[PDB]
Write a protein that binds this DNA or RNA. Structure first.
Lengths: 100, 133, 214, 64, 149, 135
RNA sequence: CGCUGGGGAGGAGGCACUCUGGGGGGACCGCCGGCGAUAAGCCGGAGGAAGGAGCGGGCGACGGUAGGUCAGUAUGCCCCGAAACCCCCGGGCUACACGCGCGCUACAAUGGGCGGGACAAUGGGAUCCGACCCCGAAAGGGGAAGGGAAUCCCCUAAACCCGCCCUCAGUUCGGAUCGCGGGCUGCAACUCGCCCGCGUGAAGCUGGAAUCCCUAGUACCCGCGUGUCAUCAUCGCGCGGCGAAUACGU
């Protein structure tokens, strides 16, 4: 049995935190791991016009939101699952887990 | 033995493989001798003519190219082929000949596009709409 | 229709386009000798390099220079032959494929007619279309004169090639004649000193005005 | 008409109202005045060592 | 010897000449009164265009199979002169391609994978390689550097 | 054997040309419909007209008379679903103009927007007339 | 499959090459001869994936412009308070003798048409993208796998190459304008919507005086997502493909 964890966030530090934590919890115990795997970064761009009126040359405002993603497979051993679900994850990170 | 190699050009990557053989060269499943057009065929054949006869008569080459137009593909392929020939033959004579002829054979180009700016975004970064006065 | 033995050509030696030699050529004009590149090559294509370096115009093959001067769309905001030649969608702009084919058919006709080497013919044409003199406006005490000034061997070539390509573009505007055939006629005339050459005409006109203002 | 070669030696400076002209020093090497360095205006990109064709050999130019 | 060793236009001509000796391949009722695409204005100027169409479809199925009736519709499209409006790429129609594929199946040259395009059978894969070996034996007289393949 | 001016119904054409382009001179007949007619007639559209026997001329004109009976598809025809007969039919030259006129006149008779626009000489299909349509 | 040697698809199984995204190095006038002043720096030349703030961008000061915005929100004074508030149902902003701005399409061969060969990138997707199969000549219609985004789809782009017809003509250029017909989105398409098929076939044969944009993967040329969007892009913001000419100044 294997378990696959997907992580997304606007901050790289939280991702590195979670990765290090689960990597160490899996290493101190005997479990073959996978990753960390980087997926491409998702960028939401929005180009708008500055002026609230019409007059004036057109100067445009380009905003961007980058979102970094990570993937892991952990092999879902006896205690690994129950000791990994007991993690202290910040609320700026989206973590999901799927059993294959 | 086998030697693998790569080559780049604007939005285009080529992977090449070389070994012992008869003299065949395929670019993406079709022989070089029937590549079209001629302006893209001479580009790929130049190094095989420079190297000579007794060198290419005893190598079989293969190339797989992906991305960016027939000219980009042909140049990436010529680059890969030249690098592989040199790696396989170990001749500074061949190296100096190629570099005299054209140094981009072995030192690829390093030019991509430039982003666009907001007056005529489709046309380009420095083309602008026409003023009136 | 071209035969297959010409549609699928494979060069066996290092010659211009794999067909014509470049060592038997000669130049007797020392002012231009070092600016006419006659290096043994096959494909005369430089992908823009040698352009941002000031004197990079001396490491490019005259054939590629002629090709890039052939990549034309008539003449805009000035007039040649008595007309604006504006095309805007039917022009070979950024089409070296078509320019290459044109120059190829041209050199074919030249070799077929003259019984000589088209590159040697082109060299003699460029010589006989290279102007040695021009005019300019110099100022002293706050007035404008008109003086005659010598021209440099790097600009002579530019004007020669430009005028040849203009004559080609002119002899082909809305007439049954083709671009390649007109280019061949222009080159032959420039080499043989026939007033039918836009290029020789312009040269003699320039030198005439300059000798007058001398 | 067939002119006379002249080898450039020294760039003096740029002249002309627009800046497309160049005053230059040249020595003759073929004709009645081989030697006789002179000053001459020149139009276009030029560099030392170049060699120009002169139609008139006595029309020495102005200084700047 | 194989399809990947010869030019496509020549191969298609030499294959369409033979597609006629096969009787399961016949033009339908509406072939003469029909245009090969929204992106066109005038009708085909040939009387035997159906066979060129079906040969091209055969060979494209060979190469890019499994392939269904949308990728071929795209490859058989082009830009339409819309008048004063500017030009845009448009797709072809989906009766010619379909009837061609059905007739090829009737002749036994292609089979449909259940949910994944459409592919060639072994005899359909034999036909083309035969014709290509012939055309290559011919070209090697003019292109003497085509032998090694 | 060769002629210089052939005379299909009413109209004359140029024998130095191909038939599909020479038939294009009859109002109501294009290049596409000409191609269709010639195909249903059994004639190469690449032969220089003039080599056109009275046989072929008669066949073409009988075709033109009743196309949907010889198998010309009903959709590839000038006037489908005529007002007072159904009867998808085709019209060339002298008949055509009268149909146009009668259509516009019946639009004018019921006092409709399109007929009023036809009268005044203005556009009819929803265009904007402020910057263009200058005489 | 030929002349027996070559050539493709699964699958296991691997990460080598490609790619993705984290960290780190590397280029600094540092070495080499002048000029200047023995300084500051500039210029050759060497070396070097790359050279001289490497290239492209963002952030834009103390203040002025009684510059634009009360019709983006917030806001003072006057004004309407039973109306100038709040809803519905129909019309108009699309009206046309004309003058102007910005663009699209062309006035041919450095091309029009028909048939065959090719090669991308950026981005987006829930009553949403819709492969695959079947009807219809086309526009379009009925089933429906997969997909909550490196997994599936939108997506075999156009200019380009090859072969035949046209051969300097208001034409096989041009493609407006009108007629009959067939359909989609929508509570509702006349006013006033987009798309298709057949017919009709208007000015235009290179443009006075004047005037605009551009220094390298740049301009010219070619097409493509997206923003608006129940439908509708000759527009805006971006993406790639092909690819120069001239000057290193005043």
């Amino acid at each position: 049995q294997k378990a696959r964890i997907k992580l997304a966030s606007t901050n790289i530090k939280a991702l590195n935190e979670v990765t290090d934590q689960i990597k160490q919890i899996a290493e101190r115990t005997g479990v073959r791991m996978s990753g960390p795997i980087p997926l491409p970064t998702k960028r939401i761009r929005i180009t708008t016009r500055k002026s609230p009126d019409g007059e004036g040359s057109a100067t445009f405002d380009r905003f961007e939101l980058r979102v970094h993603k990570r993937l892991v497979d952990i092999e879902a051993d006896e205690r690994a699952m129950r000791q990994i679900m007991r993690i202290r994850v910040p609320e700026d990170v989206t973590i999901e887990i799927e059993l294959i | 033995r086998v030697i693998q190699t790569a080559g780049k050009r604007k939005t285009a990557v080529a992977r090449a493989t070389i070994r012992e053989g008869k003299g065949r060269v395929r670019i993406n499943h079709k022989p070089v001798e029937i590549i079209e057009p001629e302006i893209a065929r001479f580009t790929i054949m130049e190094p095989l003519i420079l190297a000579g006869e007794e060198i290419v008569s005893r190598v079989d080459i293969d190339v797989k190219v992906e991305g960016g137009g027939f000219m980009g593909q042909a140049e990436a392929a010529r680059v890969a082929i030249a690098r592989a020939l040199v790696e396989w033959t170990n001749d500074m004579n061949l190296k100096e000949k190629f570099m005299k002829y054209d140094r981009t054979m072995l030192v690829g180009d390093s030019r991509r596009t430039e982003p666009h700016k907001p007056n005529r975004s489709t046309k380009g970064p420095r083309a602008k709409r026409q003023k009136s006065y | 229709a071209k035969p297959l033995t010409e549609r699928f050509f494979i060069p066996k030696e290092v010659k211009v386009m794999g067909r014509w030699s470049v060592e038997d050529v000669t130049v007797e004009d020392p002012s231009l000798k070092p600016y006419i590149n006659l290096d043994a090559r096959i494909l005369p294509h430089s992908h823009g390099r040698y352009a941002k370096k000031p004197f990079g115009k001396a490491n490019v093959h005259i054939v590629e220079r002629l090709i890039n001067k052939v990549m034309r769309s008539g003449a805009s905001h000035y007039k040649a032959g008595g007309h604006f030649m504006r095309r805007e969608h039917r022009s070979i702009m950024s089409k070296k494929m078509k320019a290459y084919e044109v120059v190829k058919e041209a050199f074919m006709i030249i070799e077929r007619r003259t019984k000589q080497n088209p590159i040697q013919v082109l060299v003699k044409a460029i010589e006989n279309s290279a102007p040695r003199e021009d005019t300019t406006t110099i100022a002293f005490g706050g007035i404008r004169y008109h003086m005659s000034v010598d021209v440099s061997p790097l600009r002579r070539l530019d004007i020669a090639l430009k005028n040849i390509a203009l004559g080609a573009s002119i002899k082909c505007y809305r007439n049954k004649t083709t671009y390649a055939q007109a280019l061949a006629e222009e080159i032959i005339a420039a080499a043989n000193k026939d007033p039918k050459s836009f290029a020789y005409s312009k040269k003699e006109e320039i030198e005439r005005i300059a000798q007058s203002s001398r | 008409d067939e002119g006379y070669p002249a080898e450039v030696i020294e760039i003096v400076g740029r002249t002309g109202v627009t800046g497309g002209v160049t005053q230059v020093k040249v020595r003759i090497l073929e004709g009645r005045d081989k030697g006789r360095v002179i000053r001459r205006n020149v139009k276009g990109p030029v560099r030392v060592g170049d060699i120009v064709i002169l139609r008139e050999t006595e029309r020495e130019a102005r200084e700047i | 010897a194989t399809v990947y060793d010869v030019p496509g236009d020549l191969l298609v001509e030499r294959v369409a000449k033979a597609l006629k000796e096969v009787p399961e391949i016949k033009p339908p009722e509406w072939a003469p009164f029909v245009k090969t695409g929204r992106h066109k204005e005038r009708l085909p100027e040939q009387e035997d265009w159906w066979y060129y169409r079906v040969a091209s479809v055969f060979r494209k199925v060979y190469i890019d199979g499994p392939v269904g009736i949308e990728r071929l519709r795209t490859w058989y499209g082009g830009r339409k002169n819309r008048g004063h409006a500017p030009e845009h790429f448009y797709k072809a129609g989906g009766s010619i391609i379909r009837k061609a594929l059905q007739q090829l199946e009737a002749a036994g040259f292609v089979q449909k994978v259940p949910g994944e395009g459409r592919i060639v059978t072994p005899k359909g894969q034999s036909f083309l390689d035969k014709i290509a070996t012939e055309l290559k034996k011919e070209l090697e007289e003019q292109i003497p550097e085509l032998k090694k393949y | 054997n060769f002629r210089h001016i052939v005379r299909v119904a009413g109209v004359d054409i140029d024998g130095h040309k191909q038939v599909r382009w020479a038939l294009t001179g009859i109002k109501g007949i294009g290049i596409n419909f000409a191609t269709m007619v010639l195909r249903v007639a059994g004639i190469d559209p690449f032969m220089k007209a003039g080599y056109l026997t009275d046989e072929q001329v008669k066949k073409i004109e009988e075709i033109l008379a009743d196309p949907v009976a010889h198998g010309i598809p009903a959709w590839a025809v000038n006037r489908p679903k005529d007002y007072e007969t159904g009867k998808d039919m085709h019209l060339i030259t002298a008949k055509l103009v009268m149909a146009w006129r009668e259509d516009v006149n019946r639009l004018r008779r019921i006092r409709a927007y399109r007929g009023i626009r036809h009268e005044l000489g203005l556009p009819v299909r929803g265009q904007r007339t402020r910057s263009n349509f200058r005489h």
